[PDB]
């Protein structure tokens, strides 16, 4: 209740989640949590949100299905131009910078 921002606590939690890559059974969940943070509207969380995902991928791997399912909301607002914004475009470039093969022509 006394945290000015509460962001620093969230940031470090992802890193603890990311370091848990070596456990396979956990991957099904921590992957989902990372992606939700990866899409977090908070830009500072977004920056570390994708950075932690990179650390997780070093000790694990990600397929198209999880990307497609997790990033599904991102593809929803792709119909209308005005849906994109300062951070949404940042999220788009952030997601493609890793596992780039997800997106195509």
UniProtKB/Swiss-Prot annotation:
Top-level taxon: Eukaryota
Localization per record: Nucleus
Domains as described in the record: The PI3K/PI4K domain is required for the recruitment of HAT complexes, and the MYC-dependent transactivation. Although it is strongly related to the PI3/PI4-kinase family, it lacks the typical motifs that constitute the catalytic site of PI3/PI4-kinase proteins, and lacks such activity.
Subunit-level organization: Interacts with MYC, E2F1 and E2F4 transcription factors. Interacts directly with p53/TP53. Interacts with GCN5L2. Component of various HAT complexes. Component of the PCAF complex, at least composed of TADA2L/ADA2, SUPT3H, TADA3L/ADA3, TAF5L/PAF65-beta, TAF6L/PAF65-alpha, TAF10/TAFII30, TAF12/TAFII20, TAF9/TAFII31 and TRRAP. Component of the TFTC-HAT complex, at least composed of TAF5L, TAF6L, TADA3L, SUPT3H/SPT3, TAF2/TAFII150, TAF4/TAFII135, TAF5/TAFII100, GCN5L2/GCN5, TAF10 and TRRAP.
Family per similarity comment: Belongs to the PI3/PI4-kinase family. TRA1 subfamily.
Record function comment: Adapter protein, which is found in various multiprotein chromatin complexes with histone acetyltransferase activity (HAT), which gives a specific tag for epigenetic transcription activation. Component of the NuA4 histone acetyltransferase complex which is responsible for acetylation of nucleosomal histones H4 and H2A. Plays a central role in MYC transcription activation, and also participates in cell transformation by MYC. Required for p53/TP53-, E2F1- and E2F4-mediated transcription activation.
Disease: Developmental delay with or without dysmorphic facies and autism: An autosomal dominant neurodevelopmental disorder apparent from infancy or early childhood. Some patients present with intellectual disability and renal, cardiac, genitourinary systems, as well as structural brain abnormalities. In some cases, the phenotype is less severe, has no systemic involvement and is characterized by autism spectrum disorder and/or intellectual disability, sometimes associated with epilepsy. Affected individuals manifest variable dysmorphic features.
Protein name according to UniProt: Transformation/transcription domain-associated protein
Gene expressing this chain: TRRAP
